[PDB]
Amino acid sequence: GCTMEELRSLMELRGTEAVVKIKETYGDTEAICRRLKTSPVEGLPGTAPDLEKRKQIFGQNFIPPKKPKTFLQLVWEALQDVTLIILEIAAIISLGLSFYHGWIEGAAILLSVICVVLVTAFNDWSKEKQFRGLQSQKFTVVRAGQVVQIPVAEIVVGDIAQIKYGDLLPADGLFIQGNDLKIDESSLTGESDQVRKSVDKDPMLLSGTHVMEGSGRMVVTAVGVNSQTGIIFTLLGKSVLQGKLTKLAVQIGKAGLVMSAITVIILVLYFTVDTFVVNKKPWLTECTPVYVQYFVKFFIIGVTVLVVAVPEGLPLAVTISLAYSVKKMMKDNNLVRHLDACETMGNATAICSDKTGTLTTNRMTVVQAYVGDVHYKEIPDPSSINAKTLELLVNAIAINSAYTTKILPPEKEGALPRQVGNKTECGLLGFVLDLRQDYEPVRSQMPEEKLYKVYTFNSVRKSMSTVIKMPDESFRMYSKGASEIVLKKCCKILSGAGEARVFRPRDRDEMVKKVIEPMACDGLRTICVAYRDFPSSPEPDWDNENDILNELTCICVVGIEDPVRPEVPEAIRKCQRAGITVRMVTGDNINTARAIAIKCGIIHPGEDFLCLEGKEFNRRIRNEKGEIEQERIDKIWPKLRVLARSSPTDKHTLVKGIIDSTHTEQRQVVAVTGDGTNDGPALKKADVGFAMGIAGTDVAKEASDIILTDDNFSSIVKAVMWGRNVYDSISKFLQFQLTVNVVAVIVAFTGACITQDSPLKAVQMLWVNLIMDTFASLALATEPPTETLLLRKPYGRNKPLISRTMMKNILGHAVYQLTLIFTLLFVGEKMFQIDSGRNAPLHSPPSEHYTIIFNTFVMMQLFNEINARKIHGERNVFDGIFRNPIFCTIVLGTFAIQIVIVQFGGKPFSCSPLQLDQWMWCIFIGLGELVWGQVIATIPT
Numbered sequence: 056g057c058t059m060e061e062l063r064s065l066m067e068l069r070g071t072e073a074v075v076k077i078k079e080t081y082g083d084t085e086a087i088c089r090r091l092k093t094s095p096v097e098g099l100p101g102t103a104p105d106l107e108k109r110k111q112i113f114g115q116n117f118i119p120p121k122k123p124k125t126f127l128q129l130v131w132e133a134l135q136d137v138t139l140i141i142l143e144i145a146a147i148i149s150l151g152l153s154f155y156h157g158w159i160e161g162a163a164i165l166l167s168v169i170c171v172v173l174v175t176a177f178n179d180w181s182k183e184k185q186f187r188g189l190q191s192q193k194f195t196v197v198r199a200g201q202v203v204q205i206p207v208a209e210i211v212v213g214d215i216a217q218i219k220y221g222d223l224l225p226a227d228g229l230f231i232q233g234n235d236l237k238i239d240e241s242s243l244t245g246e247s248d249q250v251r252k253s254v255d256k257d258p259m260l261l262s263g264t265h266v267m268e269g270s271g272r273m274v275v276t277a278v279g280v281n282s283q284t285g286i287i288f289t290l291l292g293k294s295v296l297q298g299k300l301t302k303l304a305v306q307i308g309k310a311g312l313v314m315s316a317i318t319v320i321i322l323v324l325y326f327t328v329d330t331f332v333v334n335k336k337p338w339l340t341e342c343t344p345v346y347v348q349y350f351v352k353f354f355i356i357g358v359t360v361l362v363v364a365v366p367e368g369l370p371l372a373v374t375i376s377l378a379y380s381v382k383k384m385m386k387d388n389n390l391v392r393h394l395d396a397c398e399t400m401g402n403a404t405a406i407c408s409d410k411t412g413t414l415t416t417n418r419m420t421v422v423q424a425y426v427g428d429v430h431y432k433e434i435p436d437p438s439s440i441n442a443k444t445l446e447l448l449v450n451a452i453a454i455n456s457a458y459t460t461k462i463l464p465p466e467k468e469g470a471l472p473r474q475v476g477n478k479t480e481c482g483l484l485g486f487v488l489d490l491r492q493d494y495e496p497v498r499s500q501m502p503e504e505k506l507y508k509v510y511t512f513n514s515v516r517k518s519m520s521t522v523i524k525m526p527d528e529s530f531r532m533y534s535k536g537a538s539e540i541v542l543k544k545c546c547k548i549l550s551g552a553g554e555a556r557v558f559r560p561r562d563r564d565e566m567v568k569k570v571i572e573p574m575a576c577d578g579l580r581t582i583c584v585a586y587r588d589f590p591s592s593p594e595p596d597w598d599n600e601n602d603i604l605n606e607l608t609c610i611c612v613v614g615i616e617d618p619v620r621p622e623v624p625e626a627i628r629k630c631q632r633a634g635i636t637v638r639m640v641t642g643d644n645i646n647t648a649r650a651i652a653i654k655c656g657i658i659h660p661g662e663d664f665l666c667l668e669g670k671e672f673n674r675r676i677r678n679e680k681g682e683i684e685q686e687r688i689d690k691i692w693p694k695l696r697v698l699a700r701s702s703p704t705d706k707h708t709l710v711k712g713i714i715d716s717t718h719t720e721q722r723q724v725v726a727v728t729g730d731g732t733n734d735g736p737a738l739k740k741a742d743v744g745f746a747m748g749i750a751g752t753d754v755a756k757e758a759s760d761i762i763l764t765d766d767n768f769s770s771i772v773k774a775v776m777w778g779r780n781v782y783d784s785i786s787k788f789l790q791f792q793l794t795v796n797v798v799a800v801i802v803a804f805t806g807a808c809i810t811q812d813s814p815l816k817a818v819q820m821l822w823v824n825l826i827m828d829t830f831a832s833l834a835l836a837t838e839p840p841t842e843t844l845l846l847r848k849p850y851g852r853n854k855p856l857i858s859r860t861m862m863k864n865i866l867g868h869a870v871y872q873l874t875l876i877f878t879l880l881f882v883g884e885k886m887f888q889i890d891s892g893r894n895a896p897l898h899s900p901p902s903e904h905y906t907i908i909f910n911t912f913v914m915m916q917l918f919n920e921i922n923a924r925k926i927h928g929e930r931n932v933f934d935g936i937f938r939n940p941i942f943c944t945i946v947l948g949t950f951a952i953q954i955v956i957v958q959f960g961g962k963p964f965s966c967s968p969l970q971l972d973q974w975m976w977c978i979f980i981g982l983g984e985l986v987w988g989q990v991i992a993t994i995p996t
């Protein structure tokens with residue numbers, strides 16, 4: 056009768072509000088313990104496997120992954136695409152209809168489909184397997200009187216667990232009793248500062264959070280999936296480019312159907328009119344045996360024109376370009392996982408970045424210091440002050456801090472140093488390392504037993520101190536604490552390299568406070584270090600702390616802050632001028648979020664944009680009854696930059712509101728960056744979700760698409776560059792392929808209706824469509840990206856792939872190619888003085904006349920791609936071709952293969968040898984394309 060639904064309802068209500076709720080729902084966290092068969096002493100007294108299985112109805116505390124399949128499931132999933140469906144349907148209907156009493160086209164289309172499916176499946180499998188490479192127990196529980204180590208999987212509701220510093224909490228719990236406990240909830244909650252846990256205030260232990268200092272015992276309330284991490288994890292279970300490609304594919308396939316209908320209608324009408332103009336058929340009974348065969352042949356003639364129109368090489372070329380771009384992007388520490396999220400970042404219009412972890416290094420470090428009455432805005436050289444102050448400070452910081460608090464090297468490659476102990480006095484300890492000194496020998500010389508008296512931190516006075524009597528017969532004391540707490544108890548200060556001077560509270564404490572205000576304005580918390588030496592004779596009374604804690608001598612005041620990453624301020628500036636507006640959504644305090652937002656440049660001074668808290672954000676959107684309407688979100692999202700104190704649901708609500716909104720003129724593509732379990736839900740809804748590699752939890756990397764291995768914010772810009780470059784490469788390849796297809800379909804239409812022979816045989820067109828154009832995509836997608844791409848404004852979510860300038864080049868070069876092909880077909884026989892091959896008995900040697908047309912058609916395309924490298928109105932189409940060796944290599948290889956094919960082809964390729972004069976004439980006719988390119992560029996678009 057525990058009704059675990061109310062138990063998990065007791066969770067997810069962190070803060071002092073939990074204390075209020077448990078006061079009316081329960082007693083003082085001992086009533087709930089009584090509602091279970093447990094006691095604070097020897098909780099769950101009998102292990103009792105039957106009782107353990109009885110309480111196992113709550114959870115088993117284990118969640119395994121899936122690992123869907125090795126290769127078959129991915130292959131099967133890849134086959135369900137619109138483009139491949141129409142390609143395979145056309146292939147199968149062409150192959151089947153070739154036998155009605157064809158063999159080549161169906162096999163070619165099927166082979167292309169197999170190739171694209173295999174490439175996509177292999178790339179996805181390789182990336183998925185590589186992702187798990189970077190992502191690759193028992194603690195004290197009082198079972199029966201004696202505390203006994205037990206594995207994590209055996210934890211059940213009601214177990215009493217003991218927690219000491221350095222442990223990792225396996226399940227949610229309630230604070231029973233313990234010393235001063237501090238829990239780091241930076242990953243789960245998102246609060247930068249350490250949270251103090253006590254029975255009186257905030258007794259809400261959460262799973263998956265480290266414990267910094269203190270010891271205690273807790274009950275276990277939510278064991279497995281019901282825990283806070285489990286809820287988010289189990290909630291985690293059509294790129295923009297694919298939508299545009301599918302729309303283009305269904306628009307192109309629609310166009311060829313009209314042409315096929317035109318061919319069949321015109322030919323059938325011609326046959327009927329010609330037959331019924333000279334004589335009249337019986338019309339009575341002759342229609343059964345042979346009349347239907349004419350129309351079936353006409354239908355076959357129409358279908359063979361329909362087949363040519365659709366581009367059978369588009370999917371393979373797009374996949375090859377995307378694969379090359381993905382492989383080239385890994386050198387910038389971006390690990391794309393789906394192979395189709397490579398382009399989604401290029402046209403991004405908004406970024407929602409987490410504060411802690413992503414924008415900030417998540418480590419407390421000393422930003423600025425004040426030593427010797429000389430303000431230093433930056434960490435100084437140790438030789439700067441060069442006095443006894445350096446050694447005295449080092450000794451004070453080392454001795455006064457707790458010996459458990461220590462800093463350890465990463466002992467790894469490319470990682471930040473780890474901080475185990477209290478990180479409020481670990482940046483202060485790291486200040487010594489920043490001054491290029493050694494703290495460890497000082498502590499090793501004086502252990503605890505050689506420290507006479509220690510004044511531990513207490514609630515009454517926010518200060519900590521220690522006293523060491525070693526150096527001489529006289530005594531020495533060090534003190535560390537908050538700024539104003541110790542400053543008012545300070546009577547002297549050091550001045551540069553000189554001795555102490557009177558810190559009388561007349562205009563001097565006032566000036567010190569005057570320099571303190573900028574530190575508090577910049578968000579820095581102020582901590583000061585003081586010291587005082589005691590005479591040996593008489594022996595002072597340590598019990599009387601009234602006066603020994605006063606008359607201190609401050610040495611320095613240092614500011615402690617959670618600083619921004621070194622490269623964030625510039626990266627945001629670049630991506631903000633490229634049309635991408637940046638927002639900050641975090642679960643930390645509103646005061647801390649605002650201070651760091653200004654430094655990163657997200658919000659500039661002037662109070663132009665509103666910053667809202669999470670509770671107000673939830674309250675405003677809901678329209679009384681308690682449902683979310685898009686109008687309310689459209690009210691506030693256009694000018695909401697900082698969102699603080701947000702639960703994971705709020706982040707998901709915001710990124711859903713922006714995507715599904717038509718308030719603005721253009722549709723929005725939202726990308727979200729994060730590193731914690733908070734951004735689990737928000738990374739899924741985002742179109743492309745980045746995640747930190749070395750400083751990110753496992754849930755964040757499960758919901759991400761592009762993992763930043765080097766976890767540096769400067770690689771967001773390069774993702775934009777590469778996305779825009781991929782879009783440009785796909786645009787230019789489309790520009791090339793559409794001209795090829797238009798010319799081919801018009802030639803086939805003319806060779807079907809007006810004449811009975813087509814100069815381009817089925818075998819000849821296979822090589823041009825499949826082999827030559829596939830290598831022509833890799834030669835066009837290999838141009839190196841440049842920084843100049845970051846000035847173009849983002850494109851819309853619904854803007855068609857074919858721009859206005861691309862329609863000028865597609866139809867412009869179709870005019871030039873058609874006229875020359877037609878003239879070489881009709882009147883080329885007299886030009887070359889060669890015997891005509893216009894008509895054949897269908898069993899004849901390959902005519903030289905048609906080989907001229909085929910070689911001219913191929914040779915004009917080789918110089919069409921050298922022209923197709925400029926999508927915009929660039930006249931100079933030869934720029935940077937030298938910085939592209941693979942392009943020239945592919946062009947020359949294609950030319951040599953064309954020579955070999957045409958010279959040694961024979962019957963299978965419907966080609967005959969050519970004399971060198973005809974080769975030169977064909978090469979010149981091809982070279983005319985470059986000259987015509989300037990003319991076609993001259994016309995305004």
Ligand code: BEF
Nearest residue numbers: 245409411731733
């Ligand atoms: F504060 Be973040 F969401 F880790």
Ligand SMILES: [Mg+2]
Nearest residue numbers: 411412730731
């Ligand atoms: Mg974070």
